Design a protein around this ligand. Structure first.
Ligand SMILES: CCCCCCCCCCCCCCCCCC(=O)OC[C@H](COP(=O)([O-])OCC(O)COP(=O)([O-])OC[C@@H](COC(=O)CCCCCCCCCCCCCCCCC)OC(=O)CCCCCCCCCCCCCCCCC)OC(=O)CCCCCCCCCCCCCCCCC
Ligand SMILES: CCCCCCCCCCCCCCCCCC(=O)OC[C@H](COP(=O)([O-])OCC[N+](C)(C)C)OC(=O)CCCCCCCCCCCCCCCCC
Ligand SMILES: CCCCCCCCCCCCCCCCCC(=O)OC[C@H](COP(=O)(O)OCCN)OC(=O)CCCCCCCCCCCCCCCCC
Ligand SMILES: CCCCCCCCCCCCCCCCCC(=O)OC[C@H](COP(=O)(O)OCCN)OC(=O)CCCCCCCCCCCCCCCCC
Ligand SMILES: CCCCCCCCCCCCCCCCCC(=O)OC[C@H](COP(=O)(O)OCCN)OC(=O)CCCCCCCCCCCCCCCCC
Ligand SMILES: CCCCCCCCCCCCCCCCCC(=O)OC[C@H](COP(=O)(O)OCCN)OC(=O)CCCCCCCCCCCCCCCCC
Ligand SMILES: CCCCCCCCCCCCO[C@@H]1O[C@H](CO)[C@@H](O[C@H]2O[C@H](CO)[C@@H](O)[C@H](O)[C@H]2O)[C@H](O)[C@H]1O
Ligand SMILES: CCCCCCCCCCCCO[C@@H]1O[C@H](CO)[C@@H](O[C@H]2O[C@H](CO)[C@@H](O)[C@H](O)[C@H]2O)[C@H](O)[C@H]1O
Ligand SMILES: Nc1nc2c(ncn2[C@@H]2O[C@H](COP(=O)(O)OP(=O)(O)OP(=O)(O)O)[C@@H](O)[C@H]2O)c(=O)[nH]1
Ligand SMILES: N=C(N)NC(=N)NCCc1ccc(I)c(Cl)c1
Ligand SMILES: [Mg+2]
Lengths: 51, 97, 347, 459, 63, 320, 48, 36, 112
């Protein structure tokens, strides 16, 4: 609707920002499953510990 | 000089005795009342308070109590001191001189 | 002026500058300055009034005296090294003369007296050339001879310019005099960092040129030359007041605007060299500039000054001046701080 | 933090693309949704801070300040829309844009890891704040108030810029996580005395420190209501937040460098509280009350103990909601009688019964009635300064007596006694005004049931 | 976010920031030595090019 | 192309279009002197463009849709109010005169732009060269303050110096009692309140100051009421003028290019008509100025630059 | 004809519109073509 | 209403200089069109 | 090279992505210039001259792309120079022997 389309801007900004925050984590995986504290063996079908 | 006179102050209740104080347009005035009350009170304060009440162990305060109980049980069972003055093992330290 | 002659004279101004920047021979550098001065006088004289004649005369005497001192430095250098290559000089006395000659050309204090008067006496479009393009040639020489420059002399010229430029602008109501004293203060920052990192001189120079060109263009768009004339802009072109506001705050070095970047990068370079008192003094003294920029914002944008009845006639006619590159320049004048690392392109 | 930065930016096209009469409805509604999502920052761990990326991070200190920042924007919009009713539409939108841009700078300021990034955004808050005061203030003096505000801040911030750049060259980084591990002790020398001052004086002017405070009463008397709310609720806390962070790298020199500033704050709080008893301007009284409260914060930050850092964090949050509420209460009278004089309109409880209850609740939190978070913060600071030196209890005790006196005196003078006979335009309270007051006090009093979330990293 | 993701995300942040700090300190040291000794690519101020010299026999022999 | 240096470089030169009939002619006289009729006949006979006397709404007629705007956008200047209350405290008298000078200044630029752009001459009824006679008459009757005269001369000094004077000045000398008799015959209620002393001051200003001055640089033709009726004789005299005076003889393509660059830019034409000389009659305070400007932007086809107003039927905005 | 005088921008300057779109199209083609050649030369020099 | 500059306030910025002194008392604003 | 914007050696470096966040910002700046162009000339700010607005973005992106390439090349050159100098002067950059905190002595300053 042309009357109420402005009401998606801020919610879409939040989704886009949530999206960009998660991709930013993907550039910081140098130590995923490599810390002395949390290092372990991968679960039988697990590809990564977190993402 | 060539200056407009100062306008008299407008009482929003004169034209709209039901005014909520938000806008001179009655329909907008009512909508602006509803968003403030719904998003302010119904959502942020009620759901936000509920969210805060059920935060999962804010700053592991509960875990530390469970962990302390586990250590106290183990150390008393084995006759160890409950807590030691030295935080770090002196065998890993090398004093000067 | 005939439009074809005006273009030819403008290209001669540019060619004189270019010769200075591409020459490896001191004689050709001197020729570039001579050519540039020859072609700049007609554009200062182009409205034929006594004030324009006075400005051109005062400009001619100052630049001619400086070019004589430049040639004297070149010949002393020839006596003591037997060569003409444009680079460090091989005699301390030649270095002082060349440095003073170039300070005279740039209008740095205490050789600054001509800049406010010449700028006031020439049209806005001529003042735009005087305070922007004309800095390129002397700065490009300073960029090449700085290893032989006496450190005490260059920093003294820088400190005095920041002080004189800051104090001089406080007493001004004429827009061209305000810009002139703004220029003197900004040349001071450019030369303070020259001994340490010439790249930051270029960065400060380029950013200064962009903001100064923005201000002069906006003054031309409304034909404003006084503070009170500029205070009418709100009742004609409200958008222009917002652009003037942002540009002035940028020229004041306020974050997060582009004009913060050169002051910020210069402070960094001098601190790396264990120079703490000088950057601190310069930054504090630069608040003098921020004060009389803020004053302009008060009368132009943040308050509505009284108008006149005849202004209503102006409401009916569109703005027909070219205002070339203003939308681009104003955006670069204000919004470049997130791109600061791009200063390495100048390295 | 992008999940908050981007939606905050989207409030700008939302305002500019809204229908002409829906600018207040749309911006208020969506800035409340942003405020709602800000509670996701409560994912705070006991050992590690929440480190999102190379640029931004949250811990228990910045999180409550971030939530206060994002909650204040919708409140500032309701507070402002009445006195801006005759403004032309484009200038209303520009006003809202200045508020949105101020929130954008604030949430970035509180989450920046790197201290130069903090400095730039910390400085960027000056521009919109100055514009709001000087453009949309009411009286002639707003131009001077803008100048005092600008130059007090810059006189302090420019030396800070030099010191921070110096620190990075020596240490190699200004990332706050790195500074936690690479920090080295500050040894005695005249060089380090001035490094200490350059690192602190900018934040002291913001608090403001007693003796550097005279800009604050001018700014408040001249600013519009939204300007006062952001100034009192959040902008003063930039100084507190900056000091809480930068004191990490100033040890042990703070042990003796703090003394002149503890004496100013300990004595300053008594003098500003006593000044409040004689103020004639209601906005000026509240401004002096803020100086008195922030004096405790400075003392708590300077003595550097776990209890004082918890007290400082709680006081900063409690003061923000209380002082912002008091300005809104004072403004609602002003929008009726168009004067800030406290003695002009009296006996207002007789004419506005419910609004008098908001006055009572606001005053009770200002004098720190147990168990409000205002008292929790003040009590924690009083406990820690007692260990610092037992004698301070006398200064703290006297201030608590005087604070109750001017808090109730303000309530008694304006709400009790006989109503002014000739003032006959005291119309009933609007729903907007009552909702505005209750959106301050209700979150404030709800926090009493769960104080830990405002006690900061030392909890 | 779980505590392991934040914990190991912090390590990645620390590694980058720590490496940048070390490189910043080296650059200050490298710049100091290059400027004092002129034996590096930086602070290399020009000298006259020797390919400009005429090596042919001159009009007179002593040169 | 829109006129400018590029068009000039490509041949658009004033001398290639101006002929021997490219003359600027102005008709002057006292009130109710039949100058409007004589001016209309000269233009018809000579094939020149006729410009009616520039009134309060002259600028309205050249912009937008051409229709007069409400009076608030003219500053409430009223010629009718001037006759009824010439000494009113709202400063209507000088505000009208300052407004009228600006309207004439705009009209003179429109006239010169027409002449330089097409080579066709124009006929005006009074001009910025003769507008001062009303100012002097107003001052001598005590209708305006001395400071008003100083402001008028300041504005006139920095505007008239840019423009060339008329080629021909046609003065129609009707004695004051005859004019005073014709005003009554014309049956205008407010105009009938004029006094002979005011009319005599107007006449004195022409003969004392205007005509002697214009003779130094223009061809001045004078006539009586009877001699004026013979339009053919007047046009016969004009066609037999020598043209050996005035600055028009020193003009060339170069100088006329600069003149055409000025007169085509109306904002540059009016630049100095609103100098910040805070005089009560012409000074408007910020609040009134602000809201009147806002009302102006709401008039049909006035929010945006001409050609970008959808509310008046402009099309292709997304490509203009 | 609402306007008493023909506006300068009454009708779009079709040539200039064609030039504007042509320049934008050319620049985008040049950029993508440049970027692709940069990628290929980058991989040839590093043997990817 | 919000205060806006009046004529007296505007005239502070209309002089030859901002800070009058005995030495500049004879200075006058330059011509509007720069022509003398 | 001398007086070369992007010397030939710069082609070894990966090109900036067309989705570079800095390049998007430059594109945004170009968009803003387009709006300010409409505003100063009193055109409808959002709708007027879409052809003109398209070239503002394209122009900024095109120029911004090459400035980004030179920027990245100059920092790569800076790192390349610095590492070579460190390699060629190992005596000025010795690998110091690091000690652990158990070994190193740091004064304690009580906060009381
Ligand atoms: C990375 C760091 C940060 C970013 C750095 C970016 C640096 C700036 C990037 C370059 C910006 C150039 C300006 C953007 C283009 C805007 C003009 C436009 O689109 O109008 C279309 C233009 C004319 O439009 P207009 O309606 O007459 O007026 C447009 C503006 O008002 C005209 O405004 P104006 O009066 O200012 O005109 C100036 C322009 C003259 O305007 C033009 O003629 C267009 C030239 C655009 C050149 C594109 C430069 C980028 C390509 C580099 C190679 O000057 C030039 O020629 C620029 C060269 O049409 C063309 O000429 C197409 C180009 C044909 C060749
Ligand atoms: C007695 C009633 C029962 C009770 O205590 O409730 C349970 C709890 C307290 O009891 P509890 O801590 O034992 O939790 C009970 C639930 N279990 C058993 C699972 C632990 O109440 C609350 O936690 C209320 C929290 C209110 C705080 C949040 C207020 C809303 C914040 C809105 C944000 C905008 C305002 C600005 C904020 C400023 C910065 C923070
Ligand atoms: C980056 C900075 C870009 C600066 C662009 C400036 C464009 C010129 C200013 C735009 C405003 C309109 C304009 O074209 O300027 C007018 C002026 C010509 O003079 P004018 O009075 O208009 O008419 C001449 C006939 N007598 O135009 C001129 O005379 C040109 C003078 C400005 C040229 C010097 C610009 C500074 C140096 C740029 C180098 C950047 C490194
Ligand atoms: C992103 C990284 C970079 C970060 C640095 C910050 C960049 C921002 C600075 C960008 C450069 C400035 C350009 C700002 C655009 C302003 C355009 C605008 O908002 O509208 C102006 C408004 C419209 O006026 P007009 O169009 O003529 O007529 C209105 C009828 N509808 O005109 C008016 O109505 C006049 C209103 C009165 C004047 C009010 C002045 C206060 C508001 C000023 C806001 C801009 C301040 C810029 C400073 C930076 C802010 C952080
Ligand atoms: C964010 C801040 C960064 C933005 C910088 C954008 C500058 C424009 C891009 C140009 C990039 C470039 O390659 O120029 C850098 C060049 C290097 O300086 P150079 O003396 O040649 O020696 C360098 C050795 N360190 O030096 C320069 O080009 C900068 C000096 C500019 C002087 C302007 C001269 C204009 C002459 C133009 C003549 C043609 C007329 C147009
Ligand atoms: C980051 C942002 C940097 C600034 C972006 C450049 C400003 C572009 C907006 C602008 O200049 O125009 C304002 C416009 C005024 O509205 P309008 O009724 O159309 O009047 C214009 C008549 N031609 O407003 C509009 O109607 C167009 C909608 C966009 C308005 C954007 C407002 C800009 C405010 C910037 C304040 C600083 C932000 C931080
Ligand atoms: C504005 C005033 C302009 C007046 C210009 C007057 C002409 C100036 C002529 C300068 C030429 C002589 O310049 C001077 O010559 C002597 C002769 O070796 C140099 O030599 C002198 O200084 C250096 C110092 O280490 C050594 O060479 C030596 O110890 C000493 O004799 C000076 O370093 C040089 O500065
Ligand atoms: C080359 C890349 C260019 C990218 C451009 C992307 C956006 C382009 C938008 C083009 C269409 C804009 O079209 C224009 O929008 C605004 C608001 O949206 C409308 O005008 C508006 O006025 C006011 C607000 O100021 C409100 O009543 C309402 O928002 C709307 O009516 C215009 O009626 C419409 O003509
Ligand atoms: N105050 C003032 N009145 C003016 C001015 N120009 C014209 N008027 C008045 O406009 C009215 C009509 O103008 P006139 O042309 O002189 O009289 P007319 O009868 O309509 O025209 P003719 O008889 O043909 O000459 C007169 O009352 C004039 O006084 C002016 O510059 N100032
Ligand atoms: N003279 C100075 N101190 N400054 C200076 N230009 N130093 C040269 C060091 C340097 C810095 C950045 C880059 I990128 C590059 Cl390639 C080289
Ligand atoms: Mg007539």
């Amino acid at each position: 609707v042309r009357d109420h389309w402005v009401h998606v801007l801020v919610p879409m900004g939040f989704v886009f920002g949530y999206y960009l925050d998660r991709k930013n984590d993907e550039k910081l995986t140098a130590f995923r499953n490599k810390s002395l504290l949390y290092k372990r063996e991968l679960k039988p079908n697990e590809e990564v510990t977190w993402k | 000089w060539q200056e407009d006179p100062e306008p008299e102050d407008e009482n929003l209740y004169e034209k709209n005795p039901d005014s909520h104080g938000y806008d001179k347009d009655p329909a907008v005035d009512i909508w602006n009342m509803r968003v403030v009350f719904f998003f302010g009170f119904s959502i942020v304060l009620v759901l936000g308070s509920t969210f805060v009440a059920y935060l999962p162990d804010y700053r592991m305060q509960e875990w530390a109590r469970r962990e302390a109980e586990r250590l106290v049980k183990y150390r008393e069972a084995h006759g160890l001191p409950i807590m030691e003055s030295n935080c770090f093992d002196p065998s890993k330290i090398q004093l000067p001189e | 002026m005939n439009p074809i002659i005006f273009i030819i004279i403008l290209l001669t101004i540019m060619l004189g500058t270019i010769i200075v920047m591409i020459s490896s021979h001191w004689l050709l550098v001197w020729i570039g300055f001579e050519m540039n001065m020859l072609a700049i006088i007609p554009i200062m004289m182009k409205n034929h009034n006594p004030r324009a004649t006075e400005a051109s005369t005062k400009y001619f005497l100052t630049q001619s005296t400086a070019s004589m001192l430049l040639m004297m430095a070149v010949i002393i250098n020839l006596m003591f090294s037997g060569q003409w290559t444009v680079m460090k000089l091989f005699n301390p006395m030649a270095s002082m003369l060349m440095t003073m000659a170039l300070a005279m050309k740039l209008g740095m204090a205490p050789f600054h007296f001509w800049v406010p008067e010449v700028t006031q006496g020439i049209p806005l479009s001529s003042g735009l050339i005087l305070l922007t393009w004309q800095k390129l040639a002397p700065m490009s020489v300073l960029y090449q001879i700085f290893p032989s420059i006496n450190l005490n002399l260059i920093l003294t010229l820088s400190v005095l310019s920041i002080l004189i430029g800051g104090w001089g602008g406080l007493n001004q109501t004429q827009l061209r005099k305000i810009m002139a004293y703004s220029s003197i203060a900004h040349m001071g920052w450019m030369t303070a960092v020259l001994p340490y990192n010439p790249t930051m001189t270029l960065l400060n120079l380029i950013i200064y040129i962009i903001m100064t060109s923005t201000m002069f263009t906006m003054f031309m768009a409304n034909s404003t030359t006084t503070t009170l004339s500029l205070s009418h802009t709100w009742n004609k072109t409200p958008i222009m007041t917002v652009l003037i506001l942002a540009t002035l705050l940028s020229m004041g070095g306020l974050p997060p605007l582009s004009g913060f970047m050169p002051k910020w990068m210069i402070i960094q370079e001098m601190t790396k060299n264990n120079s703490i008192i000088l950057p601190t003094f310069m930054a504090i003294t630069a608040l003098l500039n921020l004060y009389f920029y803020m004053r302009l914002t008060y009368s132009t944008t943040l308050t509505m000054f009284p108008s006149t009845n005849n202004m209503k006639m102006k409401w009916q006619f569109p703005l027909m001046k070219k205002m070339t590159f203003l939308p681009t320049m104003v955006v670069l004048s204000t919004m470049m701080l997130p791109l600061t690392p791009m200063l390495s392109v100048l390295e | 933090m992008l999940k908050y930065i981007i939606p905050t930016i989207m409030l700008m096209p939302l305002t500019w693309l809204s229908k002409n009469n829906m600018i207040w409805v749309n911006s208020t509604a969506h800035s409340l949704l942003i405020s709602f999502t800000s509670l996701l920052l409560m994912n705070q761990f006991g050992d590690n801070s929440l480190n999102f990326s190379l640029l931004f991070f949250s811990d228990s200190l910045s999180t409550p300040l971030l939530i206060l920042t994002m909650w204040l924007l919708p409140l500032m919009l309701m507070a402002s829309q009445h006195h801006l009713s005759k403004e032309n539409l484009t200038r209303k939108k520009l006003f809202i844009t200045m508020l949105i841009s101020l929130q954008l700078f604030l949430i970035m300021t509180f989450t920046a890891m790197e201290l130069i990034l903090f400095y730039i955004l910390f400085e960027a808050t000056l521009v919109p704040t100055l514009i709001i005061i000087t453009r949309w203030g009411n009286q002639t003096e707003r131009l001077n108030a803008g100048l005092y505000f600008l130059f007090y801040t810059l006189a302090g911030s420019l030396p800070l810029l030099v010191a921070l750049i110096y620190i990075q060259n020596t240490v190699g980084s200004l990332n706050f996580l790195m500074l936690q591990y690479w920090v080295q002790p500050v040894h005695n020398s005249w060089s380090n005395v001035f490094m200490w001052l350059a690192c602190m004086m900018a934040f002291m002017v913001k608090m403001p420190l007693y003796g550097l405070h005279l800009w604050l009463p001018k700014a408040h008397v001249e600013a519009p209501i939204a300007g006062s709310m952001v100034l009192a609720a959040v902008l003063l806390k930039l100084g507190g937040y900056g000091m809480l962070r930068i004191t990490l790298i100033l040890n042990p020199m703070t042990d003796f460098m703090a003394y002149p500033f503890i004496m100013l704050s300990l004595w300053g709080m008594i003098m500003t509280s006593s000044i409040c008893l004689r103020q004639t301007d209601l906005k000026s009284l509240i401004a002096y009350s803020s100086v008195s409260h922030m004096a405790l914060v400075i003392v708590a930050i300077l003595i550097q103990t776990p209890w004082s850092y918890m007290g400082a964090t709680a006081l900063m949050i409690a003061h923000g909601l209380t002082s912002s509420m008091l300005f809104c209460l004072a403004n609602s009278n002003y929008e009726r009688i168009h004067s800030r004089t406290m003695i002009l309109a009296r006996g207002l409880q007789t004419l506005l019964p419910l609004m008098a209850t908001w006055w009572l609740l606001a005053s009770l939190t200002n004098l720190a009635l147990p168990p409000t978070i205002n008292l929790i913060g003040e009590l924690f600071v009083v406990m820690s300064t007692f260990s610092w030196s037992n004698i301070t209890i006398i200064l703290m005790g006297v201030n608590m007596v005087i604070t109750a006196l001017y808090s109730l005196y303000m309530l008694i003078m304006t709400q009790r006694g006989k109503y002014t006979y000739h003032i006959n335009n005291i119309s009933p309270s609007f729903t907007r005004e009552n909702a505005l007051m209750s959106l301050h006090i209700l979150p404030l009093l709800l926090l009493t049931l769960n104080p830990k979330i405002i006690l900061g990293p030392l909890y | 976010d779980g505590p392991e993701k934040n914990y190991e995300r912090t390590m990645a942040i620390l590694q980058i920031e720590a490496e940048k700090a070390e490189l910043r300190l080296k650059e200050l040291e490298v710049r100091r030595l290059m400027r004092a000794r002129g034996d590096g690519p930086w602070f290399h101020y020009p000298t006259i090019d020797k390919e400009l010299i005429d090596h042919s026999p001159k009009a007179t022999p002593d040169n | 192309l829109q006129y400018g240096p590029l068009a000039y470089i490509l041949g658009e030169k004033a001398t290639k279009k101006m002929t021997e009939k490219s003359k600027l002619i102005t008709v002057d006289g006292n009130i109710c002197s039949g100058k409007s009729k004589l001016a209309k006949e000269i233009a018809e006979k000579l094939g020149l463009k006729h410009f009616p006397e520039a009134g309060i709404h002259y600028v309205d007629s050249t912009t937008g849709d051409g229709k007069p705007l409400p009076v608030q956008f003219s500053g409430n200047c009223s010629l009718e109010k001037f006759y009824d209350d010439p000494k009113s405290n709202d400063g209507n008298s000088y505000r009208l005169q300052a407004w009228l000078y600006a309207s004439r200044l705009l009209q003179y630029a429109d006239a010169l732009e027409h002449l330089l752009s097409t080579g066709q001459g124009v006929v005006l009824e009074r001009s910025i060269y003769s507008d001062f006679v009303f100012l002097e008459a107003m001052y001598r009757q005590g209708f305006i303050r001395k400071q008003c005269v100083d402001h008028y001369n300041q504005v006139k000094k920095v505007t008239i110096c840019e423009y060339l004077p008329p080629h021909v000045v046609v003065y129609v000398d009707v004695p004051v009692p005859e004019v005073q008799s014709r005003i009554q015959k014309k049956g205008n209620p407010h105009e009938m309140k004029i006094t002979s002393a005011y009319l005599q001051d107007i006449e004195n200003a022409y003969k004392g100051t205007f005509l002697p001055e214009m003779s130094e640089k223009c061809e001045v033709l004078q006539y009586s009421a009877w001699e004026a009726q013979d339009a053919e004789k007047v046009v016969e005299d004009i066609e037999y003028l020598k043209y050996d005076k005035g600055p028009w003889l020193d003009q060339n393509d170069r100088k006329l290019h600069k003149l055409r660059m000025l007169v085509q830019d109306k904002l540059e034409v009016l630049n100095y008509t609103s100098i910040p000389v805070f005089l009560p009659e012409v000074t408007v305070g910020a609040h009134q100025s602000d809201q009147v400007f806002q009302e102006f932007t709401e008039l049909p086809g006035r929010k945006y630059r001409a050609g970008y107003n959808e509310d008046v039927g402009d099309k292709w905005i997304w490509l203009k | 004809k609402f306007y008493i005088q023909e506006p300068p921008h009454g009708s779009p300057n079709w040539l200039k519109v064609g030039l504007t779109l042509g320049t934008s199209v050319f620049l985008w083609i040049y950029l993508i073509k440049q970027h692709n050649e940069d990628v290929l030369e980058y991989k040839r020099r590093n043997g990817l | 209403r919000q205060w806006q500059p009046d004529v007296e306030w505007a005239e502070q910025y209309g002089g030859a200089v901002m800070y009058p002194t005995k030495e500049t008392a004879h200075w006058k604003p330059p011509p509007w069109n720069d022509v003398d | 090279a001398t007086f070369q914007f992007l010397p030939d050696e710069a082609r070894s470096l990966p090109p900036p992505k067309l989705t570079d966040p800095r390049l998007a910002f430059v594109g945004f700046l170009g968009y803003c210039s387009g709006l300010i162009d409409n505003a100063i000339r009193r055109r409808p700010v959002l709708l007027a001259g879409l052809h003109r607005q398209l070239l503002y973005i394209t122009s900024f992106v095109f120029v911004g792309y090459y400035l980004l390439k030179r920027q990245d090349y100059m920092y790569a050159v800076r790192d390349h120079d610095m590492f070579s100098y460190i390699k060629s002067h190992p005596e000025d950059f010795p690998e110091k022997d690091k000690k652990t905190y158990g070994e190193v002595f740091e004064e304690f300053h009580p906060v009381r």
